[PDB]
Amino acid sequence: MKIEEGKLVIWINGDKGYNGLAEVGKKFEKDTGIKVTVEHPDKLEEKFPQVAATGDGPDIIFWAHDRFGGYAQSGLLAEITPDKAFQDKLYPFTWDAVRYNGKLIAYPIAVEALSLIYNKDLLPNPPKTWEEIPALDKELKAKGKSALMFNLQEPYFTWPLIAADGGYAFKYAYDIKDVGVDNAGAKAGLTFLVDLIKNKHMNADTDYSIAEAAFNKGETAMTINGPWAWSNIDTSAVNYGVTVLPTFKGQPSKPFVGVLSAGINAASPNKELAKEFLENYLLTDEGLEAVNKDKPLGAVALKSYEEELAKDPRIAATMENAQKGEIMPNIPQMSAFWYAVRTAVINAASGRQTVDEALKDAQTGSELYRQSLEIISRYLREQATGAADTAPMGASGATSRKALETLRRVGDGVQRNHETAFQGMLRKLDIKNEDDVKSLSRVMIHVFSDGVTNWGRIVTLISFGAFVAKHLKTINQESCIEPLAESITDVLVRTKRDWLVKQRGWDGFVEFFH
Numbered sequence: 001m002k003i004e005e006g007k008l009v010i011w012i013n014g015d016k017g018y019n020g021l022a023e024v025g026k027k028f029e030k031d032t033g034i035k036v037t038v039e040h041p042d043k044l045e046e047k048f049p050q051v052a053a054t055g056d057g058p059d060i061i062f063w064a065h066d067r068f069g070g071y072a073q074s075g076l077l078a079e080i081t082p083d084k085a086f087q088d089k090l091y092p093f094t095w096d097a098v099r100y101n102g103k104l105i106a107y108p109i110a111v112e113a114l115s116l117i118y119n120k121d122l123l124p125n126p127p128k129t130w131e132e133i134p135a136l137d138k139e140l141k142a143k144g145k146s147a148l149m150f151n152l153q154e155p156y157f158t159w160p161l162i163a164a165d166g167g168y169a170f171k172y173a174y175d176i177k178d179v180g181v182d183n184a185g186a187k188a189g190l191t192f193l194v195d196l197i198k199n200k201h202m203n204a205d206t207d208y209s210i211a212e213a214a215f216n217k218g219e220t221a222m223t224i225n226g227p228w229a230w231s232n233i234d235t236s237a238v239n240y241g242v243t244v245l246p247t248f249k250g251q252p253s254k255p256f257v258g259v260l261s262a263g264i265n266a267a268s269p270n271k272e273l274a275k276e277f278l279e280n281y282l283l284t285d286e287g288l289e290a291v292n293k294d295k296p297l298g299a300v301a302l303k304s305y306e307e308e309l310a311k312d313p314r315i316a317a318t319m320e321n322a323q324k325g326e327i328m329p330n331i332p333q334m335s336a337f338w339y340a341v342r343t344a345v346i347n348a349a350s351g352r353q354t355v356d357e358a359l360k361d362a363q364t365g366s367e368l369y370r371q372s373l374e375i376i377s378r379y380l381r382e383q384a385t386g387a388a389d390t391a392p393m394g395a396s397g398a399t400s401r402k403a404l405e406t407l408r409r410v411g412d413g414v415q416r417n418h419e420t421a422f423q424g425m426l427r428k429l430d431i432k433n434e435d436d437v438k439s440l441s442r443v444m445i446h447v448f449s450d451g452v453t454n455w456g457r458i459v460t461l462i463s464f465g466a467f468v469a470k471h472l473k474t475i476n477q478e479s480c481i482e483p484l485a486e487s488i489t490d491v492l493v494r495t496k497r498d499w500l501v502k503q504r505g506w507d508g509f510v511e512f513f514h
């Protein structure tokens with residue numbers, strides 16, 4: 001096994017209090033002899049799944065809870081099992097952010113929400129509305145200042161605006177069926193941001209460091225950022241305030257609220273040490289203070305210490321923005337949702353795509369897994385049992401239905417022509433239970449990847465899946481059909497997502513075979 005036993009490697013993002021954390025790590029090493037290394041690798045949310053999947057990575061990973069459902073579902077997180085007493089030390093709603101399929105998959109640490117940060121010397125009264133910001137920037141430009149700079153390379157920062165007039169990721173009733181990414185609310189918000197850019201009030205290349213530097217150098221009146229940012233502002237001597245985000249179309253900006261959480265790698269041979277470190281050293285008044293004093297955490301999950309931080313008006317403002325926002329879902333396709341929306345915002349802002357085009361593709365990217373699983377699960381189950389599924393597809397499921405119709409039609413031929421091939425291939429393998437279905441995945445990934453990417457080969461891969469699902473039914477392993485469909489779907493979207501989106505997803509499929 002890759003991960004070193006007898007020490008702890010922790011990953012946390014480089015904008016958080018890593019030095020403070022490492023100090024908590026020193027304390028732990030002092031009492032236990034166990035060294036703690038805190039690293040803040042770049043793109044660590046991307047890297048964790050890649051490396052943890054191969055039995056590697058940090059013992060503990062810090063990120064907002066939104067990425068942990070992906071990780072938990074891929075088996076990359078140890079289930080955590082803190083006792084009732086410990087559980088009572090943290091806010092139930094923070095524990096809620098770390099519950100995935102009924103299990104606690106991470107330790108909650110802090111609730112984070114973007115707030116509007118402003119320079120009180122430049123801007124005594126922060127704009128209440130986004131709509132006033134263009135006029136406000138006119139004024140400020142007259143003095144060689146700008147109104148607002150915030151990170152346009154990460155959709156997190158734009159999201160409160162996109163979500164203000166009705167955009168949403170997955171409707172909470174999480175109907176993963178209902179994606180709000182390209183609705184009129186999203187369009188209106190992202191259109192507003194794009195007009196800010198076209199009218200020179202924002203620059204589309206502005207990233208974290210540039211917005212930060214401009215706010216911290218007094219060049220811009222406002223930014224949008226989280227509590228982690230306040231330390232650098234303190235050091236810069238800007239007289240800043242932290243306040244409610246502006247409204248858009250009379251409605252609050254709805255930031256996606258994150259619970260900074262700490263997950264223990266399923267591959268870690270140091271789970272007990274990680275539980276000890278997180279429960280008894282980090283999630284303590286002193287532990288969270290050390291981290292917070294370095295870069296503020298937000299509203300911490302630990303009740304005792306949050307009662308002290310709650311008096312800080314910057315935290316009250318963070319909580320104000322959090323209550324107007326929504327807790328991020330932790331469902332596995334959050335990763336894809338964010339990747340899609342990131343690209344949409346970058347492209348809309350740079351003019352590479354219109355808002356319409358960009359959010360359409362983002363809707364497609366966001367829906368891709370679920371849409372593909374719906375198609376593939378259905379096809380696989382109707383092929384194995386001979387009977388179609390009676391349940392409707394959703395309100396956005398004309399595509400599913402047409403793609404399934406296409407798949408039936410094209411897939412019939414492909415299975416029929418490949419029956420002898422598939423029987424031989426199927427015979428090679430022992431495919432008798434759910435334990436073999438994960439093996440399949442590798443075989444199928446490897447074979448699928450080996451050749452050119454086109455819809456005909458996608459049909460072949462799904463058709464072999466259909467073949468196997470039939471085999472699984474015949475041997476009373478119908479319960480393995482869904483896992484096979486999930487596995488095929490994962491293979492397909494993880495390795496072909498960009499291609500899939502370029503083809504307009506399953507609409508492209510229908511079109512290619514029309």
Ligand SMILES: CCc1sc2ncnc(O[C@H](C)C(=O)O)c2c1-c1ccc2[nH]ccc2c1
Pocket residue numbers: 421422425443444447448451457458460461462464
């Ligand atoms: C793991 C079984 C899978 S998954 C899959 N996905 C896409 N395409 C596939 O095969 C098509 C025919 C191709 O090679 O282009 C396959 C095959 C497959 C099946 C039976 C076979 N006999 C010889 C090769 C072969 C390959």
Ligand SMILES: OC[C@H]1O[C@H](O[C@H]2[C@H](O)[C@@H](O)[C@@H](O)O[C@@H]2CO)[C@H](O)[C@@H](O)[C@@H]1O
Pocket residue numbers: 013015045063064065066067112154155156157226258260338
């Ligand atoms: O921008 C997409 C990104 O949004 C959130 O990431 C935040 C994170 O929650 C904060 O703690 C801080 O690190 O800034 C990030 C934005 O760059 C999501 O948590 C993340 O999964 C997502 O990709």
